[PDB]
Amino acid sequence: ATVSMRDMLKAGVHFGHQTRYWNPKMKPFIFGARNKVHIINLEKTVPMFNEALAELNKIASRKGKILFVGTKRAASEAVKDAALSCDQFFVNHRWLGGMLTNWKTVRQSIKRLKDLETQSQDGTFDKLTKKEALMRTRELEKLENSLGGIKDMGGLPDALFVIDADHEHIAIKEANNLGIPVFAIVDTNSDPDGVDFVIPGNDDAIRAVTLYLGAVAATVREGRS
RNA sequence: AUGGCUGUCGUCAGCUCGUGUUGUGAAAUGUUGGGUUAAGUCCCGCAACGAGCGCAACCCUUAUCCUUUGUUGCCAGCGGU
């Protein structure tokens, strides 16, 4: 449902970027500057985080398909487990340019993953030679590394969850073109114009992103009840 | 005025298209870049995702061996010459 302010300092969600890379549009969401490092205003994010979680909850109550987005090293594996914990979908390694705006052409690539999976469990690769069986399994390995989170998708997402918004500005722009509401974790270096429901928080720490991922995988499941 | 056929750049590795995105727009992207190759041949990354003509392969011949077949072909092991 909601979390307090005491655990905010434990995860370091106020530990933003320096006074060199900050975005000018972070003035309503910066508490101050400690040793030339901007501190995220923790009194401003806690009313804005819970209204997004209730915004993420009722869309999940109407059988909403939530998509998770994050392609950074610190949160590449944490975003995969959080989506499956709440029975949702994820994008973890690489966001393909045109994954949502060009949804038609990537579906042939999605079924191009499915026929390789049906050729994996039944025992089909073993009849072919060494060269053919190696590359089509190597083409397989690249496939669910970038499309395995959305191989169960079958449509356009109802809502979008974004980590490292400035690093994933392509994903936010793609959902904005189709009118899909996004849920981005904006840090001091990021731009929140594309973000419909702004959540100011630190995104460069493993323990910080798991606090959001743990909370967003928690808020979905009672909407499933 | 043409069909059909042919040479040439050049058997040079390029030529494009669909969707999406960018730019008012001509168009750009993909096709660029780090490696790599005879080759946009392959890997990775990347607002690109895929596909087609090209490359290669599939075709013929040559390079070694096995099986079957032995004439008008062949002559190792046995005879007459």
DSSP A90-142: EE-S---TTSSTTHHHHHHHHHHHHHHHHHHHTT-GGGS-HHHHHHHHHHHHH
Contact A183, A51 (CB under 8 A): no
**Whole-number Cα distances in Å, A80 to A83, A92, A143:** 6, 7, 15
Residue A32, beta-bridge partner list: A39
Which H or E run contains A38? strand A37-40
Burial class (CB in 10 A: 0-12, 13-18, 19+), A213: buried
Q: Are strands A15-18 and A37-40 parallel, antiparallel or unpaired?
A: antiparallel
- Output phi, psi for A38, to 5 deg: -70, 140
Rg, chain A, Cα only: 19
Q: Which two tokens stand for residue A64?
A: 């909403």
Q: Which two tokens stand for residue A184?
A: 């981005």
User: What residues have CB less than 8 Å from A180, skipping those under 6 apart?
Assistant: A100, A156, A157, A158, A159, A160
Using C1' positions and the CA of A113, the closest nucleotide is B50
- One-letter amino acid at A125 equals F
Q: Look at residues A182, A204, A169 and name the one whose alpha carbon lies nearest to residue A95.
A: A169
Residue A183, beta-bridge partner list: A161
The spacing between the Cα labelled CA in A94 and the C1' in B35, in angstroms, equals 21
Residue A33, beta-bridge partner list: A38
The spacing between the Cα labelled CA in A22 and the C1' in B4, in angstroms, equals 72
Neighbours of A52 (CB within 10 A): 23
Q: Resolution, rounded to a tenth of an Å?
A: 2.9
User: What residues have CB less than 8 Å from A182, skipping those under 6 apart?
Assistant: A159, A160, A161, A162, A172, A175, A176, A194, A195, A196, A197
Q: Look at residues A161, A133, A150 and name the one whose alpha carbon lies nearest to residue A52.
A: A161
Burial class (CB in 10 A: 0-12, 13-18, 19+), A222: exposed
Q: Look at residues A95, A73, A69, A93 and name the one whose alpha carbon lies nearest to residue A83.
A: A69
Q: DSSP readout, A43-93?
A: HHHHHHHHHHHHHHHHHHHTT--EEEE--SGGGTTHHHHHHHHTT-EEE-S
Write the DSSP symbol of residue A190.
Answer: S
The spacing between the Cα labelled CA in A116 and the C1' in B70, in angstroms, equals 53
Residue nearest to nucleotide B20 (CA to C1'): A102
Q: Which two tokens stand for residue A128?
A: 């072919």
Neighbours of A128 (CB within 10 A): 12
Burial class (CB in 10 A: 0-12, 13-18, 19+), A140: middle
